[PDB]
Design a protein around this motif. Sequence first.
Motif, PDB file in Angstrom:
ATOM      1  N   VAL A  84     -31.553  51.448  78.120  1.00  0.00           N
ATOM      2  CA  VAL A  84     -31.208  52.682  77.420  1.00  0.00           C
ATOM      3  C   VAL A  84     -32.441  53.300  76.775  1.00  0.00           C
ATOM      4  N   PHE A  85     -33.286  52.477  76.162  1.00  0.00           N
ATOM      5  CA  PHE A  85     -34.470  52.953  75.450  1.00  0.00           C
ATOM      6  C   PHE A  85     -35.729  52.844  76.292  1.00  0.00           C
ATOM      7  N   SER A  86     -35.628  53.092  77.590  1.00  0.00           N
ATOM      8  CA  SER A  86     -36.787  53.129  78.466  1.00  0.00           C
ATOM      9  C   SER A  86     -37.153  54.579  78.743  1.00  0.00           C
ATOM     10  N   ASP A  87     -38.430  54.907  78.577  1.00  0.00           N
ATOM     11  CA  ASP A  87     -38.902  56.265  78.780  1.00  0.00           C
ATOM     12  C   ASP A  87     -39.320  56.546  80.216  1.00  0.00           C
ATOM     13  N   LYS A  88     -39.287  55.546  81.090  1.00  0.00           N
ATOM     14  CA  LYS A  88     -39.715  55.707  82.472  1.00  0.00           C
ATOM     15  C   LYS A  88     -38.601  56.180  83.394  1.00  0.00           C
ATOM     16  N   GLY A  89     -37.411  56.426  82.870  1.00  0.00           N
ATOM     17  CA  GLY A  89     -36.318  56.908  83.687  1.00  0.00           C
ATOM     18  C   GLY A  89     -35.475  55.782  84.251  1.00  0.00           C
ATOM     19  N   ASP A  90     -34.800  56.091  85.351  1.00  0.00           N
ATOM     20  CA  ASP A  90     -33.902  55.152  86.003  1.00  0.00           C
ATOM     21  C   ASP A  90     -34.615  54.425  87.132  1.00  0.00           C
ATOM     22  N   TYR A  91     -34.178  53.191  87.379  1.00  0.00           N
ATOM     23  CA  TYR A  91     -34.717  52.355  88.450  1.00  0.00           C
ATOM     24  C   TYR A  91     -36.224  52.169  88.316  1.00  0.00           C
ATOM     25  N   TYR A  92     -36.690  52.031  87.079  1.00  0.00           N
ATOM     26  CA  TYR A  92     -38.046  51.561  86.812  1.00  0.00           C
ATOM     27  C   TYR A  92     -38.004  50.046  86.938  1.00  0.00           C
ATOM     28  N   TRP A  93     -38.243  49.558  88.157  1.00  0.00           N
ATOM     29  CA  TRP A  93     -37.961  48.165  88.477  1.00  0.00           C
ATOM     30  C   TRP A  93     -38.745  47.189  87.614  1.00  0.00           C
ATOM     31  N   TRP A  94     -39.960  47.548  87.198  1.00  0.00           N
ATOM     32  CA  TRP A  94     -40.750  46.627  86.391  1.00  0.00           C
ATOM     33  C   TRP A  94     -40.082  46.309  85.063  1.00  0.00           C
ATOM     34  N   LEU A  95     -39.191  47.181  84.585  1.00  0.00           N
ATOM     35  CA  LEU A  95     -38.458  46.895  83.360  1.00  0.00           C
ATOM     36  C   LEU A  95     -37.641  45.620  83.468  1.00  0.00           C
ATOM     37  N   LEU A  96     -37.298  45.195  84.685  1.00  0.00           N
ATOM     38  CA  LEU A  96     -36.565  43.946  84.831  1.00  0.00           C
ATOM     39  C   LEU A  96     -37.377  42.763  84.329  1.00  0.00           C
ATOM     40  N   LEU A  97     -38.704  42.832  84.424  1.00  0.00           N
ATOM     41  CA  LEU A  97     -39.518  41.690  84.011  1.00  0.00           C
ATOM     42  C   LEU A  97     -39.405  41.402  82.518  1.00  0.00           C
ATOM     43  N   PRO A  98     -39.528  42.375  81.604  1.00  0.00           N
ATOM     44  CA  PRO A  98     -39.161  42.082  80.212  1.00  0.00           C
ATOM     45  C   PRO A  98     -37.736  41.587  80.067  1.00  0.00           C
ATOM     46  N   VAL A  99     -36.803  42.179  80.818  1.00  0.00           N
ATOM     47  CA  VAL A  99     -35.392  41.839  80.671  1.00  0.00           C
ATOM     48  C   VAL A  99     -35.171  40.363  80.955  1.00  0.00           C
ATOM     49  N   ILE A 100     -35.830  39.839  81.988  1.00  0.00           N
ATOM     50  CA  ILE A 100     -35.751  38.410  82.257  1.00  0.00           C
ATOM     51  C   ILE A 100     -36.315  37.616  81.089  1.00  0.00           C
ATOM     52  N   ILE A 101     -37.482  38.016  80.578  1.00  0.00           N
ATOM     53  CA  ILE A 101     -38.135  37.216  79.546  1.00  0.00           C
ATOM     54  C   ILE A 101     -37.353  37.270  78.243  1.00  0.00           C
ATOM     55  N   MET A 102     -37.027  38.472  77.772  1.00  0.00           N
ATOM     56  CA  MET A 102     -36.352  38.598  76.488  1.00  0.00           C
ATOM     57  C   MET A 102     -34.980  37.947  76.489  1.00  0.00           C
ATOM     58  N   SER A 103     -34.257  38.004  77.607  1.00  0.00           N
ATOM     59  CA  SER A 103     -32.962  37.344  77.674  1.00  0.00           C
ATOM     60  C   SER A 103     -33.080  35.829  77.581  1.00  0.00           C
ATOM     61  N   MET A 104     -34.252  35.260  77.879  1.00  0.00           N
ATOM     62  CA  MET A 104     -34.437  33.834  77.633  1.00  0.00           C
ATOM     63  C   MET A 104     -34.371  33.514  76.149  1.00  0.00           C
ATOM     64  N   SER A 105     -34.726  34.467  75.295  1.00  0.00           N
ATOM     65  CA  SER A 105     -34.749  34.225  73.862  1.00  0.00           C
ATOM     66  C   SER A 105     -33.378  34.338  73.215  1.00  0.00           C
ATOM     67  N   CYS A 106     -32.385  34.878  73.918  1.00  0.00           N
ATOM     68  CA  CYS A 106     -31.044  34.958  73.343  1.00  0.00           C
ATOM     69  C   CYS A 106     -30.437  33.587  73.076  1.00  0.00           C
TER      70      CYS A 106
END
Lengths: 331, 331, 331
Positions: A84-106
């Motif tokens: 939601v708070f990504s400024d690169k628009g939709d389907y910015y695939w590299w955003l998945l890489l933070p998503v994998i890492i940060m979800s490990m911290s949940c």
Amino acid sequence: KSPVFQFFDWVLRGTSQVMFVNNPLSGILIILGLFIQNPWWAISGCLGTIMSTLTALILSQDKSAIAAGFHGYNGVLVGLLMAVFSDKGDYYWWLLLPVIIMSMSCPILSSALGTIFSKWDLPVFTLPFNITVTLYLAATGHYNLFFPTTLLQPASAMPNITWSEVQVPLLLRAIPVGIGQVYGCDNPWTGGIFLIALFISSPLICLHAAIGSTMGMLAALTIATPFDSIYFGLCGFNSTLACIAIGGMFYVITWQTHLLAIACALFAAYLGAALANMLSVFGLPPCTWPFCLSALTFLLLTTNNPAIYKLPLSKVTYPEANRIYYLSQER
Amino acid sequence: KSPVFQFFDWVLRGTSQVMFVNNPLSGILIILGLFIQNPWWAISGCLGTIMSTLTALILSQDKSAIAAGFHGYNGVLVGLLMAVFSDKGDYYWWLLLPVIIMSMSCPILSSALGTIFSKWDLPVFTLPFNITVTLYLAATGHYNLFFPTTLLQPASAMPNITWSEVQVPLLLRAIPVGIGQVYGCDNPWTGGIFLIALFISSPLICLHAAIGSTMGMLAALTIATPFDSIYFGLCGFNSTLACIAIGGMFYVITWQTHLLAIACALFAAYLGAALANMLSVFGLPPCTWPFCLSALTFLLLTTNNPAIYKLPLSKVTYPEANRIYYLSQER
Amino acid sequence: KSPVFQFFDWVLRGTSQVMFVNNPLSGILIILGLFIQNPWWAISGCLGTIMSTLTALILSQDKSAIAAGFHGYNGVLVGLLMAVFSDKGDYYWWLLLPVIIMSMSCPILSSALGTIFSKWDLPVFTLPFNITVTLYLAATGHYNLFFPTTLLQPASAMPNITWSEVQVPLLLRAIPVGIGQVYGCDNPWTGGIFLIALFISSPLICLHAAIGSTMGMLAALTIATPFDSIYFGLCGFNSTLACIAIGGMFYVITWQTHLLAIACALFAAYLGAALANMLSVFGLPPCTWPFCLSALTFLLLTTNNPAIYKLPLSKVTYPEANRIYYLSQER
């Protein structure tokens, strides 16, 4: 059955636990609503849930908690609010890489806070999501070269509120949109799908969700909140979460607890406005912090009358079953 | 007697508990001082106290705590600081509506923090006031359409401090004004009335109040605080509260504890400057947060020598009675 | 021997406890490294350590803790970071006066937090330093007349990162500089001296320090951190502290705990970037807060497998002795 099917069941229950619902069909409906809203956001949320559950299994967490979905309801929000708070628009695939890492911290946080919160028998309420997303959004910021975020800045001028231009249809529609804003979705249709998902499990949760959303809307009108923000549902998701939490699940459902839940919704809406104004200074949004603070301060409340009863965490399923358990134990 | 008289007694003791004094006559003197300072501020404070006590009774809180005034000493500050930081002037009657609502949150927080603070036998020190007022002032802000607040902004230039223009009469008068600034009142006469109110109950509390105020003034001169702020008493209310709290009530009064109280006053004054500078970024003032943090960090201090003794909360009345109890129990 | 020699031994062990090392020779090497970096900073740090230990003795703290150096490892950082963030240059002698005062607050906080942290058997990790230095730097600020501080402000423009200009020699040298940045020293030679000081005591601590520093460097490259900041070592001191804390001391050293320590280093580096961006708003630096938060959230983690074992605080010396104790107790 096959382990993969059980894992997907765990993912579904995790993505349903957001509104405190433990039902795989509710999870399917919520995923469908996310596809209705934005497929990219839904992909991010599903990846967050999956990697959160893998992290929970790797860290040898409790199997019952994972099976319930207790370790997946933070990953979905993490992924959705990364998207939601990504400024690169939709389907910015590299955003998945933070998503994998940060979800490990949940899971880690969910365990750590648990060790803190076990002394007062307090459940954790999406605090791992708030901490992780605040961490990410502060680390990146709006001026990051790789993962820029949407710019949030404090208001520096008095808003113009033409009260003759208020639209009561949109003001009423702020209720389903307020429900859907829990995940970050602003589409009224996904809000309706969410309401159906809550109702299919337990009507009391849906009723308290609607009451909390409308209470947040009303509390936002009280302090002259810009109409666009209210129409967008931003003022009702903390309130609806607080109302669901305090209404009939963690307190045995009673008219006293109902009034307490309405008061908690008001407190959560005002605290939501306050935290929005404060956190806008850092450029961060108040992502579910208000619900956390209000629900935690309302579960720690000690009251002498027997009507306000707080259930032990080991025996909390949903308001109807909670009331049934209370009535059985009392007799 | 009639319930109304008992309720007004509870209100008076609550409005006296601010300087840790449990005496209805002290409450009357404090209300008189508030009328001397500003009738609108006093009306707001009295409404806050009344609605806080009603909320405490409704929520079935402990009758002994209500009778002591433990649930009214946050409402008075809430109302007074609603009125102090209002940009609409005096007798802005609509300001009473937030005052009623926010004062309802003082008992809840006071219970909730209590459940947190019971594990380390720590009393709560106006934290409900700080949380509630921070919530309100952040939610509204300076640019609110309904309840605008006074604009506080961080300093962006080096202050001009002409040390040849310092006025020692005003510097000394900062002591009674520092005492009166606990409630937000800047009138030296209401500071004198407050000092009389503390002295009529227990001279040790008045002595520690004066020592804390002068210590805050001195600590504010150490870091080149603008002279207008010191003359206005802004630098001595956290210090005087900390000195009263640590001096002779929550620690058995002894010269060791006296030096500890002076050190706590210094820590509270420096933390007051720090929190002022930090919170000015959000536009919020450091309303009694420094006293809270300093007193809590000084009550948790564990020291091996027997002179520094921390009393159980069930048996804390005032420094003379505290020392009498300690001497009786020791023998 | 003579009390003065024992006191200087306590000071040396305190100045060594920063990297969790209890060895007077390591303290001598660290003091020598500080002289190599900047004599003024070293003088400030030594004064901080000395006054912190005097405050600990005055407050009748535990003699074993003082002898170990548990009360001196916050004074050294306090003095060093008073000197690092001073805008008046070198040998601004008046800066010693805050250094004396603020270092008195290190023992108090160290006791107070201990009383909080004893319930979950958590050790304190330089939190007194963070609280005290945040207090000082907020109270003074960049626009103070007496003790101005270096100006830190949030980034308001997108950094220019020419990836073709990256220098892998400096990127590798960020590891020893990352080790040396724990104290605030940026000289690579003092980083090497620090690495020698850790290695002379226990090789596992040195290995985990290098791994944590390089992990912080890598995690800082992941979010497009300006190259000057990475070369200066700013991104590796929280990470190296977290890696040392979680690697082999407070968890029995095992490959599972090794991976956990690497994950903690990543979490600490990302949280370091986040806290830098957030705290730059107030003008404050993230002085060791990230390591504190990450290590505390990773010690509270509860895991079912027997490989991840958390030692009781009464029996924590260094990773080799910790593993020896675990193996003896298990058999």
